Amino acid sequence: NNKFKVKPLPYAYDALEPYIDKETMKLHHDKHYQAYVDKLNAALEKYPELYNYSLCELLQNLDSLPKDIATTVRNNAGGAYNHKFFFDIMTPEKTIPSESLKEAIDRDFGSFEKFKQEFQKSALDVFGSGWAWLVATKDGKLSIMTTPNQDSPVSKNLTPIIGLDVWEHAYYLKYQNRRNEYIDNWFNVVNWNGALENYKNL
Amino acid sequence: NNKFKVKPLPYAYDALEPYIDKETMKLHHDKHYQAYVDKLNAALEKYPELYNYSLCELLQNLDSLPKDIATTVRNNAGGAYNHKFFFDIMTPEKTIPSESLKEAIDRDFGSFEKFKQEFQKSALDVFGSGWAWLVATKDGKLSIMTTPNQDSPVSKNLTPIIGLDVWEHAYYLKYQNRRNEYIDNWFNVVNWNGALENYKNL
Ligand SMILES: [Fe+3]
Ligand SMILES: [Fe+3]
């Protein structure tokens, strides 16, 4: 069975309290993330060789996939990739920026505080469903960008370093309309060591 | 003061229980709808003559508004118009299709049940944030369509007859990921008399 699979949550479902509630972690991982994976697998039954593509390969070739599944793959491979990435980029452990990522942030944004203010504003300003990202070009230059729905920077040859889900399902149970509070609290759980590994993998 | 205003909810905040929870009615009307109106008013301070346009006129002329506010008006006039419409199209009173709207539904969909199945599927399939609509052309022909985010059929010269908000804020507190249950339950509160008036106003 080479079908796509849901990666088990890398920590306990209540591990990110009180910043993200356990009930939301359960729904977000066990229902939403699961649905993207199930729908993706369903769409590829017609073209089983695509089970041998990685999620990244699917996202990098949306415009050359067979026409009848291009959109469903964009949405569901997007959802699967983004959520796996998102749960991996959070942690109950205490972490801080270090090494080349720490330096790159200062280089490209001036300081960590300036980077943080820009990321928070970009996340706050996403209209509708979507994501805010810290991304790197192939040469390691950092920038902040957003994507709508489950679109991914990977599709634009940009490599995600950290990313924040601002679909309302990600924050409504605890924060309701107060997305600003969700965004601010999320920085307490960002896994900077994972972010560093993402940056090093260029 | 000719600024745009939030229309007071046309019934008690708990009037739509148990189909839509009181807490959601409060947030949806007092926070989300309010924010669209506030942001719209803010954007028009630079062009105060636009306070004399109706919301419909704004939505019908997005591509000819001054370039610097076109997008913010699309989103926020959209939000203001759509929510006023949405709260108006629900009621705690019992209503059923009648008169020309009842006949048009049978004419254009075959039966009410066929109309309902199509509407429910369209609402379920909206990906990301958006709306499902029953709309009419100027000549009274009915169809079902969806819009993303706060885009409106009005901008495409289609007249909304009923419409359902499927942004996650509209259903997450009570239904979480189970949008299907929200959609099915919503038909208990559709105001068919209001829908008839919408259809007659062509
Ligand atoms: Fe999500
Ligand atoms: Fe809404």
Q: Tell how many helices (H) and how many strands (E) occur in chain A.
A: 9, 3
The partner residue sitting opposite B172, judged by closest CB among A128, A129, A168, is: A168
Q: Is the CB of A148 less than 8 angstroms away from the CB of B128? A: yes
In chain A, the largest separation of any two C-alpha atoms, in whole Å, equals: 49
Contact A177, B32 (CB under 8 A): yes
Residues of A near B (Cβ–Cβ under 8 Å) read 27, 31-32, 35, 75, 127-130, 148-150, 167-169, 172-173, 176-177
Radius of gyration of chain B (CA): 17
The 10 Å Cβ neighbour count of residue A103 is: 11
Q: How far apart are CA A111 and CA A198, in angstroms?
A: 20
Q: How far apart are CA A18 and CA A13, in angstroms?
A: 12
Q: Is the Cβ pair B35, A167 closer than 8 Å?
A: no
Q: Under an 8 A CB cutoff, do A35 and B127 touch?
A: no
Domain covering B92-202, topology: minor pseudopilin epsh fold (3.55.40)
Chain A residues within an 8 Å CB radius of B149: 127-128
Please name the residue of chain A whose CA is at the shortest distance from the CA of residue B130. A128
The crossing angle, in degrees rounded to 10, of helices B99-109 and B112-125 is 70
Chain A partners within 8 Å of B167 (Cβ): 128, 168
**Looking at domain A21-91, which of 1.10.287.990, 3.40.190.10, 3.40.50.920, 3.40.140.10 is its CATH number?**
1.10.287.990
What is the rounded distance in angstroms from the CA atom of residue B132 to the CA atom of residue B167? Answer: 10
Residues of B in contact with A127 (CB under 8 A): 75, 149
Inter-chain touch B173–A177, beta carbons under 8 Å: no
CA distance A188 to B8: 39
A29 appears as a binding residue in the annotation: no
Residue B29 CA to ligand 2 centre (angstroms): 8
Torsion of CA A68, A70, A76, A79, to 10 degrees: -170
Q: Which of A149, A173, A176 sits opposite B27 (nearest CB)?
A: A176
Method: X-ray
Residues on chain A touching B177 (C-beta within 8 angstroms): 27, 31-32, 35, 169
Ligand nearest to the CA of A33: 1
- Count Cβ atoms below 10 Å from residue B184 Cβ, excluding itself: 16
Classify residue A5 as left (phi > 0), alpha (psi -120 to 50) or beta.
Answer: beta
Q: How far is CA B74 from CA A9, A125, B39, B78, in A?
A: 39, 15, 11, 5
The token duo for B109 is 């969909």
| Ligand 2: centre distance to CA A94 (Å) | 37
Amino acid at B130: G
A165 is in an annotated binding site: yes
Q: Of A27, A75, A177, which has the smallest distance from its Cβ to B176's Cβ?
A: A27
User: Per-domain residue ranges for chain B?
Assistant: 21-91, 92-202
Beta strands, E only, chain A? 130-136, 142-148, 159-165
Question: Rounded to 5 degrees, what angle do the CA atoms B103, B111, B202 make?
Answer: 35
Tokens representing B62 are 């997005």
Report how far residue B122's alpha carbon sits from residue B109's, in angstroms, rounded to the nearest whole number.
Answer: 14
Tell me whether residue B165 is annotated as binding. yes
CB contact under 8 A, A128 and B127: no
Token digits for B86?
A: 């949405």
Q: Which of B31, B149, B173 minimises the CB distance to A128? A: B149
Q: Is residue A108 part of an annotated ligand binding site? A: no
A202/B125 Cα distance (integer angstroms): 37
Q: Do A128 and B130 touch (CB under 8 A)?
A: yes
